Amino acid sequence: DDDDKMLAAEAANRDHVTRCVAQTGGSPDLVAHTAALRLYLRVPHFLTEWTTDPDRRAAVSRALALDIVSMKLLDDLMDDDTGLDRVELACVCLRLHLRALHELESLARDPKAVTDILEQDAVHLCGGQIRTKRSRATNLREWRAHASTYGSTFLGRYGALAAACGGEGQPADSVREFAEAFAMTITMADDLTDYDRNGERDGNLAHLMRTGAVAGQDVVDLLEELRGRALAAVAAPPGAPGLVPVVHLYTDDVLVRLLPRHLGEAGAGAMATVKFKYKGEEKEVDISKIKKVWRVGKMISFTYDEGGGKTGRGAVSEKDAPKELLQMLEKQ
Amino acid sequence: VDDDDKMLAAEAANRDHVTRCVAQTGGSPDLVAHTAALRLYLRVPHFLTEWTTDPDRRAAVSRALALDIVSMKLLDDLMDDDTGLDRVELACVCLRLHLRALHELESLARDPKAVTDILEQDAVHLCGGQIRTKRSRATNLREWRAHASTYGSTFLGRYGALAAACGGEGQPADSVREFAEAFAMTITMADDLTDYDRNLAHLMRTGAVAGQDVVDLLEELRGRALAAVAAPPGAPGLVPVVHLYTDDVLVRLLPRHL
Numbered sequence: 001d002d003d004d005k006m007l008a009a010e011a012a013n014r015d016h017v018t019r020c021v022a023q024t025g026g027s028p029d030l031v032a033h034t035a036a037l038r039l040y041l042r043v044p045h046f047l048t049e050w051t052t053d054p055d056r057r058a059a060v061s062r063a064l065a066l067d068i069v070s071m072k073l074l075d076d077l078m079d080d081d082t083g084l085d086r087v088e089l090a091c092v093c094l095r096l097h098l099r100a101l102h103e104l105e106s107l108a109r110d111p112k113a114v115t116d117i118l119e120q121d122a123v124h125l126c127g128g129q130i131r132t133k134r135s136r137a138t139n140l141r142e143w144r145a146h147a148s149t150y151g152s153t154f155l156g157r158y159g160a161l162a163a164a165c166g167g168e169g170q171p172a173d174s175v176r177e178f179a180e181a182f183a184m185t186i187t188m189a190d191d192l193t194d195y196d197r198n199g200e201r202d203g204n205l206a207h208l209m210r211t212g213a214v215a216g217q218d219v220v221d222l223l224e225e226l227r228g229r230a231l232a233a234v235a236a237p238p239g240a241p242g243l244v245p246v247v248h249l250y251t252d253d254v255l256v257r258l259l260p261r262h263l264g265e266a267g268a269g270a271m272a273t274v275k276f277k278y279k280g281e282e283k284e285v286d287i288s289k290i291k292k293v294w295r296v297g298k299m300i301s302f303t304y305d306e307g308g309g310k311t312g313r314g315a316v317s318e319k320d321a322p323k324e325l326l327q328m329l330e331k332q
Numbered sequence: 333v334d335d336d337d338k339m340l341a342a343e344a345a346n347r348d349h350v351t352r353c354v355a356q357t358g359g360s361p362d363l364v365a366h367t368a369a370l371r372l373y374l375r376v377p378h379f380l381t382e383w384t385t386d387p388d389r390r391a392a393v394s395r396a397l398a399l400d401i402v403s404m405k406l407l408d409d410l411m412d413d414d415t416g417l418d419r420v421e422l423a424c425v426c427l428r429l430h431l432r433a434l435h436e437l438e439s440l441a442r443d444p445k446a447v448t449d450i451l452e453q454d455a456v457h458l459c460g461g462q463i464r465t466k467r468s469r470a471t472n473l474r475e476w477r478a479h480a481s482t483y484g485s486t487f488l489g490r491y492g493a494l495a496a497a498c499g500g501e502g503q504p505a506d507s508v509r510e511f512a513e514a515f516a517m518t519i520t521m522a523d524d525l526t527d528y529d530r531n532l533a534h535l536m537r538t539g540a541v542a543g544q545d546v547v548d549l550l551e552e553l554r555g556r557a558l559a560a561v562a563a564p565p566g567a568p569g570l571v572p573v574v575h576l577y578t579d580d581v582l583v584r585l586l587p588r589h590l
Contacts, residue, residue: 078423102452111444119435
């Protein structure tokens with residue numbers, strides 16, 4: 001029923017946003033574009049997870065959706081590649097944003113809190129986007145520095161706004177920490193998808209991986225860092241434990257589904273090995289050279305390509321077998 | 333130190349506040365230059381804040397209005413895509429200037445909530461209005477005025493209402509806005525009759541609009557503005573401003589099209 005709350009909230013955000021686009025003279029196409037922004041429409045549900053009163057939660061959630069969609073329309077306006085009418089994009093962008101300020105300011109504890117949060121790192125956000133497009137990233141460090149502005153800072157602001165508007169029991173710092181880590185996991189996902197969905201190359205993480213400029217294991221480490229940052233934020237009292245499966249779902253999806261499209265047979269990291277003694281020598285074979293593998297009690301016995309026709313023999317304790325050997329066990 | 337001296341100092345102060353803000357958020361020299369060239373846009377906040385008795389509050393509201401007015405002009409450049417400027421800079425500077433304005437306006441407002449009230453109230457009339465304008469173009473003076481009452485009158489009306497909300501109170505808010513809506517349409521006509529060359533001009537030239545009707549509208553807007561600035565407390569300094577912009581359209585611009 002948490003998965004059902006998250007679907008209903010997306011649908012309620014989609015309803016609020018499309019009505020507002022249509023009420024301002026948005027074309028059916030532009031309405032269909034905003035209704036299509038599924039994760040943008042759902043993300044506000046994540047940011048409001050700490051909100052105890054469900055009437056305030058639903059109201060903060062739709063107001064965040066308005067402004068996130070507005071900024072997405074501004075972005076479509078600066079790319080100017082949607083085929084949507086530019087006048088509609090501009091005027092609907094403005095209208096949604098002004099409705100969002102009104103609604104957020106109606107819910108905030110403090111009258112200045114909304115404009116304080118939007119102003120505080122405006123230069124970092126707006127100058128960040130300019131430099132992202134001005135100087136294309138050529139390695140992971142550059143990719144992350146850019147992504148921390150239009151991804152992390154972008155969504156952190158909506159985290160702070162969710163805390164400011166979300167009444168009592170909101171660990172402001174932690175809502176924002178969650179938002180910033182989660183946004184970077186999503187931003188990596190979008191780069192690794194939009195390589196092919198959108199034909200994107202310059203500054204694109206997938207292009208940097210395929211090119212050799214960025215190593216798969218560095219990408220895996222960043223994803224694991226972002227997973228751990230988001231998990232820590234959601235464990236801070238009074239806690240948002242409902243967000244734990246969400247964090248795993250998005251990180252795992254990048255690891256399992258998207259990364260492999262830009263790496264290849266080997267994958268990320270060094271080729272796994274089996275260490276054993278055999279006729280008195282120290283021996284170490286690549287999981288790639290291993291042929292047959294079978295269990296006898298807690299021993300794993302196996303054969304390998306030793307060079308030429310030559311077949312080698314070994315056995316190790318299951319305690320000293322890498323996961324990759326035990327996997328071939330299960331698959332033989 | 334007369335009134336044209338106060339205006340000149342206000343216009344320079346608004347320009348400097350805008351250019352510093354564009355430069356510091358990563359605006360290129362072409363975008364900084366573009367922003368500094370928006371003379372009337374940087375000037376008009378001075379007129380809007382004529383009812384503000386504290387000179388320091390007046391300087392602060394004037395420059396805040398200038399940030400947002402320039403912001404909305406940059407959004408307008410972004411929807412036309414005809415300046416040859418970088419769309420990423422346009423968008424990012426548009427956003428930054430606007431967010432600074434919200435911050436500076438809310439810090440001056442009696443009630444910070446009044447800023448987002450004023451901006452939301454007729455947001456649909458303004459934004460729906462601009463879509464309808466750029467869709468189905470005017471073929472007579474009635475249609476032209478209908479369209480210009482959104483992107484001109486409602487546009488500047490909002491900044492009128494914001495000036496009164498961020499001013500020193502007693503300020504006659506309805507009259508500030510009435511001044512702004514009437515004056516806005518005078519300068520929108522002026523812009524239309526300049527921006528043909530450098531659309532009301534096309535209609536005057538192909539005789540779909542009679543000169544005498546344009547004169548009558550200008551005289552009506554002149555009277556509306558003079559009435560607004562005679563409501564108490566009163567902004568007598570705006571009388572010569574109304575005459576200057578009106579007479580300029582009658583004397584300099586109309587003859588170019590008749």
